[PDB]
Design a protein around this ligand. Sequence first.
Ligand SMILES: C=CNC(=O)N1CCc2c(sc(NC(=O)Cc3ccccc3)c2C(=O)OC=C)C1
Ligand SMILES: [Zn+2]
Ligand SMILES: [Zn+2]
Length: 329
Amino acid sequence: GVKTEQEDVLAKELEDVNKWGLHVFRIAELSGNRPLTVIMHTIFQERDLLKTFKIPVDTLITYLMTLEDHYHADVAYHNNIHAADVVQSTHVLLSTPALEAVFTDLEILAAIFASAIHDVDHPGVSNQFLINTNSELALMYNDSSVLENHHLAVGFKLLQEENCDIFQNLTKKQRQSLRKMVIDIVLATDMSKHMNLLADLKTMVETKKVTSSGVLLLDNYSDRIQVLQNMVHCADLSNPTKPLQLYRQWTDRIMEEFFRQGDRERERGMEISPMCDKHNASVEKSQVGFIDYIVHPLWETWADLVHPDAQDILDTLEDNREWYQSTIP
Ligand SMILES: C=CNC(=O)N1CCc2c(sc(NC(=O)Cc3ccccc3)c2C(=O)OC=C)C1
Ligand SMILES: [Zn+2]
Ligand SMILES: [Zn+2]
């Protein structure tokens, strides 16, 4: 009834679960490629979600292992490790002082569950690739947020496997509300919705209302869900805000995935997607471009929303951007 030594080392690494920059690749190794399951279980216990939602623990573990198994180990970036990273990052963002006591237990559950499922069964190619290949998925979803609709359908469908229904004790009211928020959050991870999400985030910063305890004031669903959508989108795009040793590992992985799509696009003979061309790419230029145009405007606006809780994260992003720039041949 006592941890093995490997379990002990894993447990000590998980003591950093509340911190930006968790060694998530080490946790994946230590856990035997179960980063999503162990991190989720840890967060659910830490936030007392099992008791609050009457979730039986064997059901939670069974579902988590099932969900984790439906991520593709042969996909370099969009895999269970990425899912675990987004979950843990969302967990840290939810704990930010500016949001203390703002969200209900069910909204917290929605943000974390949405994070866990948000990329499940990702084939490692883009929506546009699936559309252009006449793939079944694209036909199923009428070319519209193809992957994101799929991640949702899979994440929910897996609740129906043996001893997997972690929501079995929620009321119909709780379930309908949970399901709607989860759907709204995952559909918001489609990059084609990025400019719109950011627009609404800026608007909210402009009309920002704090309240009583120095805490953000969100008094309608539209506002509450937009903050959660943006929070998870930030987590999804948090790699360049992490310590450089982590960030670089993620960059390698996504470029591996992109270059592979590029190869398959050359094989087939389609015109090669942006920065997916292995032979004449600039990994460094692309990272600087992606940060200047997407990641920095997003995180800067988030930082404004929760000022100054996110200052250290933004500084790290800026340091990493300078590093990648300095490294341009
Ligand atoms: C015309 C619009 N273009 C886009 O919407 N995309 C093109 C590039 C890109 C993503 S998502 C994503 N990256 C992420 O989603 C998270 C991440 C950021 C930085 C390093 C590793 C991973 C990238 C990217 O990194 O590009 C640079 C190589 C989607
Ligand atoms: Zn995604
Ligand atoms: Zn993702």
